[PDB]
Amino acid sequence: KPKPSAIDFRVGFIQKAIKHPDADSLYVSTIDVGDEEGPRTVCSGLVKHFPLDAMQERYVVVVCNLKPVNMRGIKSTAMVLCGSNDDKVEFVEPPKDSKAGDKVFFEGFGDEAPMKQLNPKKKIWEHLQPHFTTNDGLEVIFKDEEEKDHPVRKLTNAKGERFKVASIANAQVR
Numbered sequence: 001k002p003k004p005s006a007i008d009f010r011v012g013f014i015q016k017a018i019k020h021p022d023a024d025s026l027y028v029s030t031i032d033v034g035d036e037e038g039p040r041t042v043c044s045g046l047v048k049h050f051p052l053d054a055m056q057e058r059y060v061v062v063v064c065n066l067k068p069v070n071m072r073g074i075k076s077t078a079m080v081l082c083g084s085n086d087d088k089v090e091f092v093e094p095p096k097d098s099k100a101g102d103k104v105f106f107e108g109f110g111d112e113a114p115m116k117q118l119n120p121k122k123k124i125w126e127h128l129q130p131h132f133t134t135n136d137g138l139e140v141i142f143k144d145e146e147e148k149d150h151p152v153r154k155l156t157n158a159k160g161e162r163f164k165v166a167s168i169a170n171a172q173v174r
Contacts, residue, residue, distance in 0.1 A: 002127040004106045004142050004153075008065035008114035011094045011102035011157075012078065015039055017055035019047070023072035027055055033062055033078060034101015040064075040078045043071035049089040061092045061104055061140075061155075061163060065114050066125060083134050083171030090168055092140055095161035104163065106142040106153040132173040138164045140173050 012031040020026035020043060029042045042062070046055070061081040068077045081092040094102070103110070118124050131143045140155035140163045155163040165171055 002122070002124040003109055004128060005109040005112045006115050006118065006124050007063060007128070009081070009104035009155075010034060010062055010064055011098045011100055011104060012040075012042075012060045012062040012080070013100040014055055014058045014060060017052065019052075020072060020074065022074075026071060027052075028074055029055065029080070031060070031062060031078060031080075032100040033064055034099075041074065041076060042078045042080060043069075043074055043076040044080050046080070046082075046089070058091070059094045059098050059100075061094060063125070065117050067117055067120050081140075081173060083140065083165040083168050083173045085168050085171060088168060090165040090171070092155075092173065093164050093166070095157070095159075095163065098157070102157050104155060104157055106155055108150060108153050109142075110156075129174045134165055134169055134171040134173060136169045138167065138169060140164065 010033050012033045015030045017027045017029040020028050026043045030039045031042050032039045062078045064078050068075050083090050142153045
């Protein structure tokens with residue numbers, strides 16, 4: 001069974017973001033995710049949603065173990081987690097005093113190491129993503145319809161804190 005523990009979620013810090021020189025819809029962010037190898041290069045379709053100043057020196061949640069993607073000629077090695085509806089896109093916001101590299105995980109799905117790289121053929125991310133959302137309190141949650149005893153798991157960290165969006169309840173988080 002696909003489970004959120006397979007996914008490597010972390011807090012990232014966007015050191016710098018620039019326009020993708022060959023793709024108007026994309027920013028290229030340099031994001032510290034606590035790798036011993038330096039920051040990662042991440043391409044995000046956020047240009048129509050946020051200006052450059054909103055990108056700089058921002059703490060984000062990043063998915064870190066998907067296979068890298070060629071995004072208009074630039075290798076993107078992580079993905080910034082956002083909650084969206086039909087009209088609007090919002091960053092998932094780490095809690096106060098988060099640090100780059102902080103492990104982020106859903107309740108009950110934290111005590112196992114993520115896969116080094118997700119097997120694309122298993123589509124773990126794709127199977128799980130319809131169930132990542134936000135509650136009315138704007139906290140990111142995972143809905144586990146099978147587990148009758150624990151149908152909702154909150155996104156959290158080692159301090160048992162919460163990860164929120166600015167305004168969208170029932171958001172599409174991915």
